[PDB]
Design an enzyme around this catalytic site. Structure first.
Site, PDB file in Angstrom:
ATOM      1  N   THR A  12       0.880  -1.217   0.122  1.00  0.00           N
ATOM      2  CA  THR A  12       0.003   0.103   0.181  1.00  0.00           C
ATOM      3  C   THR A  12       0.824   1.347   0.164  1.00  0.00           C
ATOM      4  O   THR A  12       0.216   2.373  -0.058  1.00  0.00           O
ATOM      5  CB  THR A  12      -1.076   0.314   1.201  1.00  0.00           C
ATOM      6  OG1 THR A  12      -0.482   0.219   2.384  1.00  0.00           O
ATOM      7  CG2 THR A  12      -1.792  -1.253   1.042  1.00  0.00           C
ATOM      8  N   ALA A  14       3.797   3.837  -1.635  1.00  0.00           N
ATOM      9  CA  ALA A  14       4.223   4.210  -2.819  1.00  0.00           C
ATOM     10  C   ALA A  14       5.205   3.327  -3.701  1.00  0.00           C
ATOM     11  O   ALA A  14       4.954   3.241  -4.813  1.00  0.00           O
ATOM     12  CB  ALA A  14       4.820   5.751  -2.766  1.00  0.00           C
ATOM     13  N   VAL A  15       6.290   2.940  -3.066  1.00  0.00           N
ATOM     14  CA  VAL A  15       7.199   1.970  -3.348  1.00  0.00           C
ATOM     15  C   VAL A  15       6.699   0.626  -3.726  1.00  0.00           C
ATOM     16  O   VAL A  15       6.676   0.041  -5.037  1.00  0.00           O
ATOM     17  CB  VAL A  15       8.621   1.942  -2.908  1.00  0.00           C
ATOM     18  CG1 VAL A  15       9.587   0.991  -3.573  1.00  0.00           C
ATOM     19  CG2 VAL A  15       9.243   3.300  -2.631  1.00  0.00           C
ATOM     20  N   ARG A  40      -4.577  -3.303   8.770  1.00  0.00           N
ATOM     21  CA  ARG A  40      -5.449  -2.543   8.492  1.00  0.00           C
ATOM     22  C   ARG A  40      -5.561  -2.368   6.989  1.00  0.00           C
ATOM     23  O   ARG A  40      -6.848  -1.839   6.290  1.00  0.00           O
ATOM     24  CB  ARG A  40      -5.119  -1.191   8.898  1.00  0.00           C
ATOM     25  N   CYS A 131      18.328   5.535  -2.756  1.00  0.00           N
ATOM     26  CA  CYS A 131      18.136   6.146  -4.162  1.00  0.00           C
ATOM     27  C   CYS A 131      19.126   7.026  -4.699  1.00  0.00           C
ATOM     28  O   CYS A 131      19.544   6.893  -5.588  1.00  0.00           O
ATOM     29  CB  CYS A 131      16.746   6.981  -4.097  1.00  0.00           C
ATOM     30  SG  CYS A 131      16.276   7.813  -2.490  1.00  0.00           S
ATOM     31  N   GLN A 158      16.724  17.232  -3.066  1.00  0.00           N
ATOM     32  CA  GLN A 158      15.917  15.730  -2.747  1.00  0.00           C
ATOM     33  C   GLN A 158      14.696  15.995  -2.657  1.00  0.00           C
ATOM     34  O   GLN A 158      14.136  17.011  -1.576  1.00  0.00           O
ATOM     35  CB  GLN A 158      16.614  14.847  -1.535  1.00  0.00           C
ATOM     36  CG  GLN A 158      17.563  14.270  -2.132  1.00  0.00           C
ATOM     37  CD  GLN A 158      18.410  13.427  -1.006  1.00  0.00           C
ATOM     38  OE1 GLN A 158      19.421  13.819  -0.551  1.00  0.00           O
ATOM     39  NE2 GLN A 158      17.905  12.299  -0.401  1.00  0.00           N
ATOM     40  N   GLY A 162      10.689  11.447  -0.650  1.00  0.00           N
ATOM     41  CA  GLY A 162      11.822  10.619   0.138  1.00  0.00           C
ATOM     42  C   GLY A 162      11.159  10.473   1.686  1.00  0.00           C
ATOM     43  O   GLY A 162      11.857   9.581   2.301  1.00  0.00           O
ATOM     44  N   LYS A 215      25.111   7.639   4.371  1.00  0.00           N
ATOM     45  CA  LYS A 215      24.852   6.477   3.692  1.00  0.00           C
ATOM     46  C   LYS A 215      25.389   6.619   2.074  1.00  0.00           C
ATOM     47  O   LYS A 215      25.827   5.383   1.764  1.00  0.00           O
ATOM     48  CB  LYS A 215      23.277   6.283   3.439  1.00  0.00           C
ATOM     49  CG  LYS A 215      22.643   5.725   4.648  1.00  0.00           C
ATOM     50  CD  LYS A 215      21.076   5.868   4.375  1.00  0.00           C
ATOM     51  CE  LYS A 215      20.427   5.365   5.865  1.00  0.00           C
ATOM     52  NZ  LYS A 215      19.012   6.161   5.692  1.00  0.00           N
ATOM     53  N   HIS A 244      15.014  12.966  -7.605  1.00  0.00           N
ATOM     54  CA  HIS A 244      16.031  13.541  -6.963  1.00  0.00           C
ATOM     55  C   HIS A 244      17.034  14.225  -7.964  1.00  0.00           C
ATOM     56  O   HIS A 244      17.057  13.409  -8.935  1.00  0.00           O
ATOM     57  CB  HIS A 244      16.674  12.765  -5.661  1.00  0.00           C
ATOM     58  CG  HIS A 244      15.980  12.226  -4.751  1.00  0.00           C
ATOM     59  ND1 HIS A 244      16.319  11.283  -3.896  1.00  0.00           N
ATOM     60  CD2 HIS A 244      14.740  12.695  -4.071  1.00  0.00           C
ATOM     61  CE1 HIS A 244      15.462  10.880  -2.893  1.00  0.00           C
ATOM     62  NE2 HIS A 244      14.693  12.046  -3.153  1.00  0.00           N
TER      63      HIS A 244
END
Lengths: 336, 336
Positions: A12, A14-15, A40, A131, A158, A162, A215, A244
Site C-alpha cells: 500500500t 508508494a514504492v 488495516r 535512491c 532531494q 523521500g 549512507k 532527486h
C-alpha cells in the site's frame, strides 16, 4: 516460459504500489502475485495483469507459496519479516536500509555490481541501495571504469517524496496555507519546506554529517568495493514532489575529457544524456522514468583531473522499485 | 556630522527600494536623497527619514547635485550613465555586473578587501559584487586569513528573486495555477520553476559553466586578489522567493579543525554562526537580514584539510543593497 510466485510486502506504500506497476510494465514472468501489508490495509484491492489482487495480512501469510519477495514496508518490518521469509526459502530483495551494511549481504545496482547478486545464498537477502546512491553510481560507473575516481563532492536536491506521504502532504499543505494567508505548521520536517531548502536529511551523526550523507559514503564504497573512494556529501531537502537531483563534482585518477565522458554516457544503457544547453529536471524529465538522466557534463576548471555533472532520477522508480525489479530479473535469469 | 547628497538610480526596483531602506536603517549621513528612473516610472513617491521623495527622470538629472550614486538599473544603463555621473564628479557604486571585471575598477566586499575602495579614483566607479559571491567570501575570509584556501567546491540553492519581480511572479504564479489544476506557463526561466530545480543561472559559456558560475570563479579571484584559489561551482535555481543558500566544501592550505573555524566565524562580525543541530534556512533565518548566516560547519571526511559549511544570506540585502551602502560608508569615512 518459466514463471515465479512473487510477494510484495508493503503493497500500500508508494514504492510497493510502483513495484506492482513496474512488474506489470516490464512483463516480469509472474505466476502468482501476493500483496502483503499490516491488518488495516487488509482487503484493499489492486489490479495486476487485468485481475484484482487483494492485500492480505503478513501475520497470516504462508511464505512457502513464493519464490521472490520484494520488501518495502520500512526497516522495522524488514528486520522482523525478512529472516522469516528467508528461512522459508524465499529470496528477499529488500528496499530498506536495514540489511545494507550487514557484512555478508550484497548491496546491488544492476548496472554496476550485478556479480554481487550471486551472494544472495548467504542469507537469502539482497539489499536495494538508497535512491541517491543508485543514481549517482549509475552515472559515475562509466567514468570509474575508464579512469578511476579518487574523490566525489556531491550535493543533493532531494524531493519530499523521500519522506513518504507525510512529506508530500507537508509540502502541498504548507504551500496552500502560505498562499492563502494562513500560517504553515511544521511536523514531518524541523523547518518549513514550502519555498525553502533544508540542508538536513535524517538525523545528525558524531561527525557533523547526517545519516543520509553517511549512507552515500558507505554505500558507495561497498558497491564500488573500494575503501579508497572518498565521498563528501551535503544532502538537502527541496520543495519538489518527485525525483532527486544531484550536483556531482568528481576527481578522477587519470585525466579524461568531458567529450569522452559524454560519448561513454550516451553509449551506456540506463543513462539518458542531455547535451549543450539542455539538461534534465525533476518536474520536466524525471517523473515516471526507469533510467538515470544526466546533463551539465563538463571539465572541472579547478582541478587537473575533474569532471562535473548533474544527475536526476525518479527516486520511487530507478531509485527503488525499478532497481529492485531489475535485481529480480537478473536473479531469475542467472540463478533460477 | 558632515552630510552627503546621494542618488539612487533604479529607485523602483527591489534593490533600489532596499537601498533606500538600508540608508535609513543604517542612519547614513544623507543631506538630500535623489531617486532616479526612466520617464515611465516617475512622479511616484517614497518615504525617507520622514520626508517624501519624488522619483525623477534620469535624462533630466543634473548629476553635479550629488556626491555618491548607487546604481541598480541594469548593466546597459550603467554603461550609459555611470561615465556621465563620473565626469560630473560623482562616485558611482554599481550593482550590476557591467564593470566588475574592468581592471581599473575595484570589486569590493567591505569585510574582505576594504582597501581596494581607494581605486575609485581611476574612474569614479566602484563595482558591487554578485550576491552568491558576497555571502561566500564573507564566510570564507576568516578561514582564508588563518590557513589559506586552495580549492572551493560550491553548489548553490538560489531564489527566484535573483531574476527580479519577473522571477517572483513566475513562481507565485505557477504554484497557484498548479495547486488549482491549471498547467504552468514558463515566461521567464528556461523551464518550470514551481516545485522544480533548474541547474542553470544565466547563459552557458564555452567551457560548459554558466555565467553565474564563472562570476563565482572570477570575482572570488579578483576580490581575494589571488589567481591561485580554485573555484568549482554549480549554480541551481530553486523554488524559493528570497535568500540564497550555498553548499560550500573548501580545501584549506594548512589543516584546520571545524571547532576552530566555528570559533573564528562566531567572533567575526557580519557572520551569525549556527552550531549543533541548528542551521540557517532561507525562509526562516535569511529574509530581512543584513548579515551572512552559516551552519553545518564540519570537517570534510573525504580530505585531510577540508571544511564543509552551509551559507545563507538575503540576496537583495547583504547580497546587494547592504553591501553597496557599506561600501559607501567606508568611502565617505576614509576618502571624503
Amino acid at each position: 516460459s518459466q514463471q515465479f510466485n512473487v510477494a510484495i510486502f508493503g503493497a500500500t506504500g508508494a514504492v510497493g504500489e510502483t513495484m506492482l506497476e513496474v512488474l506489470q510494465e516490464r512483463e516480469f514472468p509472474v505466476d502468482e502475485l501476493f500483496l502483503l501489508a499490516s491488518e488495516r490495509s487488509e482487503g484493499k484491492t489492486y489490479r495486476f495483469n487485468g485481475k484484482t489482487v487483494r492485500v492480505q495480512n503478513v501475520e497470516e501469510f504462508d511464505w512457502s507459496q513464493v519464490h521472490i519477495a520484494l520488501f518495502s514496508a520500512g526497516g522495522e518490518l524488514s528486520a522482523k519479516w525478512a529472516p522469516i521469509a528467508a528461512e522459508a526459502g524465499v529470496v528477499v530483495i529488500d528496499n530498506t536500509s536495514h540489511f545494507r551494511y550487514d557484512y555478508d549481504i550484497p548491496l546491488v545496482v544492476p548496472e554496476v555490481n550485478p556479480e554481487a547478486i550471486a551472494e544472495f545464498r548467504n542469507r537469502n537477502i539482497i539489499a536495494n541501495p538508497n535512491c541517491s546512491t543508485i543514481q549517482m553510481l549509475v552515472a559515475l560507473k562509466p567514468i570509474y571504469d575508464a579512469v578511476g575516481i579518487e574523490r566525489i563532492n556531491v550535493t543533493t536536491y532531494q524531493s519530499v517524496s523521500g519522506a513518504g506521504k507525510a512529506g508530500i502532504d507537508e509540502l502541498a499543505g504548507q504551500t496552500a496555507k502560505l498562499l492563502n494567508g494562513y500560517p504553515a505548521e511544521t511536523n514531518t520536517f524541523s523547518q518549513q519546506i514550502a519555498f525553502n531548502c533544508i540542508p538536513q536529511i535524517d538525523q545528525f551523526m558524531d561527525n557533523g554529517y547526517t545519516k543520509e550523507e553517511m549512507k552515500m559514503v558507505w554505500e558507495t564504497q561497498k558497491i564500488f568495493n573500494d575503501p579508497s573512494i572518498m565521498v563528501n556529501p551535503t544532502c538537502v531537502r527541496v520543495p519538489v514532489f518527485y525525483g532527486h537531483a544531484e550536483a556531482v563534482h568528481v576527481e578522477t585518477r587519470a585525466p579524461i575529457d568531458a567529450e569522452q565522458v559524454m560519448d561513454m554516457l550516451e553509449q551506456t544503457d540506463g543513462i539518458e544524456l542531455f547535451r549543450g544547453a539542455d539538461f534534465p529536471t525533476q518536474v520536466r524529465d524525471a517523473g515516471g522514468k526507469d533510467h538515470v538522466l544526466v546533463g551539465r557534463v563538463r571539465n572541472d576548471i579547478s582541478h587537473h583531473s575533474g569532471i562535473n555533472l548533474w544527475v536526476v532520477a525518479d527516486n520511487v522508480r530507478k531509485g527503488a522499485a525499478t532497481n529492485a525489479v531489475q535485481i529480480a530479473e537478473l536473479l531469475v535469469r542467472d540463478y533460477f
